[PDB]
């Protein structure tokens, strides 16, 4: 009865584990032993954006490497400019508690959502120029953790009721639902082709879904605590996740197994946000001990540190052209970092 | 070029002017988080101040006392695991923790919930306003004597009524000893690790009580005064 099914489940997991080890010839570090070090990386806070009264929980760069939208728990959703610091909008939220934010690829719509199970969506370019809520996508049970605008008419929202859903804006209903993880889904990131996406949960496992088909394809289990954030490699064949054990792990899609674990013995805090560089060589990770670490994807080296924040860093985002890095935090300040020749 | 840029700055000046206005109202009100179990009279506490009216997610109740506004949040539809959304309430003025005193069964579960809240890294600086609710039913349970608190808390035989006890005139000694034991059980957790960053404010409350917003007011006022004194290093 019950024992018959569980016996197959244990054996089936054994088959996967043995299969993964079969296709593991050498580690990524072993191959990249001859790759020359990246070198010390120094970053200067080019701009500092102020105007949020409480902690910042979300931020998202625009498609034009401009107008980062950030959400804070004072009931504000400000759209900045990142040049001349001018604020473009100060959209007020119905619920003061917001845990995520989004910017549509077309730049016309901006989503929201938080401890209200509702993914409010705003139309920036209204006829009269006044921003008003266009849709209130309800149907999730738990809170909302992340929502990425997959095309201007659809949006994938990851909720705290162990589900991710794909909405249709005009209909306002769940087109498909991905009943996966056994814990809260804390983060989400769509593939560059906008076909697949991944999601890190509170069960220390990040799955991979097919948006069109609607069912999980692969499950990755290398962590040992809740996954707080997750990104994608720019080519779309790898991704990196950060969890509560202060480890960032670079998983691989085709190899279906983890490759490197970026960590240090002096770090025990726990990652809150990750993001790759434009070419994928760098991996920035927003840590809990008030500063971010600029790792090195091909070999764990910790090239640099962006130590400029007072409270914990709960945000990260690299522009489309990879020119700047914005790190919001719980001190209500967004710092736009950049390189220096 | 500057002709169009002035329009952008003019909008940014208008946005800042409204943000400054909203900064005053945001800092004027006190945000409170309400916590408790199924048996705790959380709804009855809310219904007491629900009179002052102005998938669901989180509820909010706005009540104002002595021209001071309070916001009182209660999570409506969230899963059992609350280790991830509890970090949103790291800036609230105080946490209103409601406990059903007359249960004797989930009391240990209530104690563990208080312990995790007290020791949480992001709630290390949030004072907890303890509301030992349903004190009226505790009198009935103790007076009847059918259920003995000793059966669940072994360290009750050696407990003696504290000297600083202030029972209501006409309250039985057995009830006073039993009700203060529960209070001292929670304060043992609070004083174990809370030095000066945050305190506990126990309150014996009945199912219905016309003075509960004042208790929150008279105790949120103490929290504000203590924080300002600690900012000046006078405390």
């Amino acid at each position, epitope marked *: 009865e019950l024992d018959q099914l569980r016996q197959e489940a244990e054996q089936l*997991k054994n088959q996967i584990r043995d299969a993964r080890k079969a296709c593991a010839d050498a580690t990524l570090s072993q191959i990249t032993n001859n790759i020359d070090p990246v070198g010390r990386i120094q970053m200067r806070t080019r701009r500092t954006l102020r105007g949020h009264l409480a902690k910042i929980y979300a931020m998202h760069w625009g498609t034009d490497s401009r107008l980062l939208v950030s959400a804070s728990q004072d009931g504000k959703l400000i759209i900045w400019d990142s040049y001349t610091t001018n604020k473009v909008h100060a959209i007020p939220l119905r619920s003061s508690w917001v845990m995520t934010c989004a910017y549509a690829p077309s730049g016309n719509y901006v989503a929201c959502g938080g401890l209200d199970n509702i993914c409010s969506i705003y139309n920036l370019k209204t006829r009269e120029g006044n921003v008003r809520v266009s849709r209130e996508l309800a149907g999730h049970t738990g809170y909302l953790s992340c929502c990425r605008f997959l095309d201007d008419n659809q949006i994938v929202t990851s909720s705290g009721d162990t589900t991710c859903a794909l909405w249709d804006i005009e209909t306002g209903q769940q087109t498909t639902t991905f009943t996966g993880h*056994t*814990g809260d889904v804390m983060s989400l990131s769509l593939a560059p082709d906008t076909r697949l996406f991944v999601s890190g949960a*509170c*069960d*220390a496992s990040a799955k991979l879904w097919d948006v069109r088909e609607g069912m999980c394809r692969q499950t990755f*289990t290398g962590h*040992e*605590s*809740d996954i707080n954030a997750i990104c994608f490699f720019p080519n779309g064949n790898a991704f990196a996740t950060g969890s*509560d*054990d202060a480890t960032c792990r670079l998983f691989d899609l085709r190899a279906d197994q983890e490759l490197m674990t970026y960590s240090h013995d002096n770090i*025990i805090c*726990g990652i809150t946000s990750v993001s790759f560089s434009k070419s994928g060589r760098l991996l920035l990770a927003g840590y809990d001990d008030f500063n971010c670490n600029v790792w090195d994807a091909l070999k764990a080296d910790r090239a640099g540190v962006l130590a400029g924040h007072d409270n914990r860093v709960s945000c990260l985002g690299v522009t489309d052209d990879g020119m700047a890095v914005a790190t919001g935090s719980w001190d209500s300040f967004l710092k736009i970092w950049n390189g220096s020749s | 070029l500057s002709a169009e840029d002035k329009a952008a700055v003019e909008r940014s000046k208008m946005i800042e002017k409204q943000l400054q206005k909203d900064k005053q109202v945001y800092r004027a009100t006190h945000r409170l988080l309400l916590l408790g179990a199924d048996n705790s009279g959380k709804s009855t506490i809310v219904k007491q101040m629900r009179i002052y009216h102005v998938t669901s997610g989180i509820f909010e109740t706005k009540f104002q006392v002595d021209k001071v506004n309070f916001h009182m949040f209660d999570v409506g539809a969230q*899963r*059992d*695991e*609350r*280790r991830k959304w*509890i970090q949103c309430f790291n800036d609230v003025t105080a946490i209103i923790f409601v406990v059903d005193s007359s249960d004797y069964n989930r009391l*240990q*579960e209530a104690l*563990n919930d208080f312990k*995790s809240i007290w*020791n*949480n*890294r992001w709630l290390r600086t949030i004072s907890v306003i303890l509301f030992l609710n349903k004190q009226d039913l505790l009198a009935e349970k103790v007076l009847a004597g059918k259920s003995k608190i000793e*059966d*669940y*808390f*072994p360290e009750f035989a050696r407990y003696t009524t504290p000297e600083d006890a202030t029972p209501e005139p006409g309250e039985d000694p057995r009830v006073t000893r039993a009700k203060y034991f529960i209070r001292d059980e929670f304060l043992r957790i609070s004083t174990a690790s809370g030095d000066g960053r945050h305190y506990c404010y126990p309150h014996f409350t009945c199912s219905v009580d016309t003075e509960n917003a004042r208790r929150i007011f008279n105790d949120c006022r103490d929290i504000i005064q203590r924080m300002h004194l600690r900012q000046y290093e006078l405390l």
Partner: nanobody
Amino acid sequence: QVQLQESGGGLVQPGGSLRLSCAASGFTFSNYKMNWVRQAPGKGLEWVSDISQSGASISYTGSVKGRFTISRDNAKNTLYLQMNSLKPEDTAVYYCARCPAPFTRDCFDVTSTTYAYRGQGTQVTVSS
């Protein structure tokens, strides 16, 4: 893969003794405050005992104080809890569950109806 399968359990006469061992793999069995939640039939998950990162900080629930002991072996990667003087209402399914995060003292969701880092469960029955 955080797995916390448990051993021991079964049928024991009232007033006897029993020992449960929970072996943890897939994570560093250290810097993790462990627990020993249990669930009686017809009742919700309840918390029995817990141990600190390296011992030296141990607490029990009221009903089992003085009858159970809890020990851990970081090198052996096992968590132990030894019963003594079993009573008829102690019949329950015991789980070993670790705190959500390392280097912490605020284990939050250990008795929740669902929890990722809990064991399968060992059945303990006290009857004749």
